[PDB]
Every structure is written in structure tokens, then in C-alpha cells.
Structure 1
Amino acid sequence: DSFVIRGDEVRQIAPGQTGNIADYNYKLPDDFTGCVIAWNSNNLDSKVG
């Protein structure tokens, strides 16, 4: 599964979390077997203005 979020929100991408991303955008299950891999993309996804 793939998406972009602000760097602060990576802590909501874990099993059993809450907060607007985990609540309304991407809910992981509690019994998740898997890996969450995250990296900064300011040099790719950000733009002037």
C-alpha cells in the first residue's frame, strides 16, 4: 500500500493507532503482520507556492 503524508503523521501509521489519518484515511488492523517503510520526499513532492 502506498501514499504521501506529512512527516509528523508517520506515527499514526502503526497497528491500533488513532488520529485523523488512522481514523479517516488509512486504518491498519491490530493483528497486522507487515512492515511500515517511510521516507522524506521534500526534494520530490514539494513545489514553489
Structure 2
Amino acid sequence: KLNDLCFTNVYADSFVIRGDEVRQIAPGQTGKIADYNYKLPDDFTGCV
């Protein structure tokens, strides 16, 4: 339903990551990747 809106401050966060840690990135994840390299807020609003 996204194209129905006028968004605000759109940011696309780009990188590369191993296929063995696809599931590590989410709002409320833990572990070495999502704690030491990247981090997602717990009230996140966006697309992965």
C-alpha cells in the first residue's frame, strides 16, 4: 500500500552480509552482528 502515501525523510541503508545471518537483522534482535556492526531500533518503521 506504499505508493498511496507521501513519505517523509526516506533513507535506504545499504551494505552486504553473509547468507548464514539473513535472519539476524530485525527490530529487537541480538547477537554479534546486530549488536556490533548494525543496530535496528525497536520502534522501527521501514522495509528490509
Same fold (TM over 0.5): yes
In structure 2, stretches of 5+ residues that fail to align are 1-12
Q: Is residue 2:22 matched to residue 1:10?
A: yes
Aligned-residue RMSD, C-alpha: 0.7
Structure with more of its chain in helix, by fraction: 2
Where has structure 1 moved over 3 Å in runs of 4 or more? Answer: none
- Equivalent residue, structure 2, for 1:22: 34
Name the structure, 1 or 2, with higher relative contact order (CA <8 Å, separation 6+): 1
In structure 1, stretches of 5+ residues that fail to align are 37-49
One-letter code aligned to 2:40: L
Compute the TM-score of the two structures, normalised by the length of structure 2: 0.68
| DSSP 3-state at the match of 2:21 | helix
Number of equivalences: 36
Could you tell me the percent identity over the aligned residues? 97
Quick check: which has more Rg, 1 or 2?
2
